[PDB]
């Protein structure tokens, strides 16, 4: 059992601090390499350029090819894969295109049946992908 003496505050506090490092959340938030490992460097949004487009086999039991685009961030030049929401929106993405990208929702974890894809496109060519899908605007 834990110590209970009236003069064991040092032991309690030191043990708690030592065991906080065995917590996934605390370690994830205090490791120190978070900025270097995270493509966005702690931000919520980033900008990049398109390189190619790929179709990813959705995981079982789902059968489909999700249409993502490989992008290069401007802040650091890292390569990532970003998902293009809504139907027939990959058409609005052409190679060598400027895109705004954001997180997918699960804070660096893949979402749904798309394997290894954790970002999503929020704007292409300074246009909102939702607007492009909804016809409110056209390709510049």
């Amino acid at each position: 059992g834990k110590p209970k003496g009236l003069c064991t505050a040092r032991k309690l506090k030191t043990h708690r601090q030592e065991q906080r490092w065995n917590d996934k959340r605390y370690k994830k938030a205090h490791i120190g390499t978070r900025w270097k490992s995270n493509p966005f460097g702690g931000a919520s949004h980033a900008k990049g350029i398109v390189l190619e487009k790929i179709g990813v086999e959705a995981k079982q039991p789902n059968s489909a090819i999700r249409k993502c685009v490989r992008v290069q961030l401007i802040k650091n030049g890292k390569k990532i894969t970003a998902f293009v929401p809504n139907d027939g929106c990959l058409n609005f993405v052409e190679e060598n295109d400027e895109v705004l990208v954001s997180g997918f929702g699960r804070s660096g974890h893949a979402v749904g049946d798309i394997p290894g894809v954790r970002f999503k496109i929020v704007k292409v060519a300074n246009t909102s992908l939702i607007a492009l899908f909804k016809g409110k605007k056209e390709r510049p």
Binding site: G5, L6, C7, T8, A9, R10, L12, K13
Partner: protein, 143 residues
């Protein structure tokens, strides 16, 4: 004995050469005691003595002011200076429990307090910067 160094030492505020005394042949050298105060009664070795120390509370030029602490003497290896240990308890609200802490307070130990050994309780009074690390003077030995 009292003069064992390269120089000759004396209290600044005593005229060792007064016409009346030298003519009468008096060898009773007056000695300056500054009566530390704060209810501290001058030790007999301070009031009557022969050592010179410009850092003594009673035979020097160090007033006592500021704060008065009590501690346990840890080491006496320097020349006329000791290390006092103060022990206390630190309270941590979260755990509602205490923890042991300590700090070392190096204090000048006058030769008046000739009966000083590791273990005896001591009182120390704050004084002006006396060296790189010494700012306290031994005032009373509760033992």
């Amino acid at each position: 004995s009292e003069q064992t160094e390269r120089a000759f030492l004396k209290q600044p505020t005593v005229n060792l050469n007064n016409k009346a005394r030298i003519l009468a042949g008096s060898k009773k050298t007056p000695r300056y005691i500054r009566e530390v105060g704060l209810g501290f009664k001058a030790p007999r070795d301070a009031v009557e003595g022969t050592y010179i120390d410009k850092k003594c509370p009673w035979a020097g030029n160090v007033p006592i002011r500021g704060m008065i602490l009590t501690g346990v003497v840890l080491k006496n290896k320097m020349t006329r200076t000791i290390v006092v240990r103060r022990d206390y308890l630190h309270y941590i609200k979260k755990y509602r429990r205490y923890e042991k802490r300590h700090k070392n307070v190096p204090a000048h130990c006058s030769p008046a307090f000739r009966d000083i050994h590791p273990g005896d309780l001591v009182t120390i009074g704050e004084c002006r910067p006396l060296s790189k690390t010494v700012r306290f003077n031994v005032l009373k030995v509760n033992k």
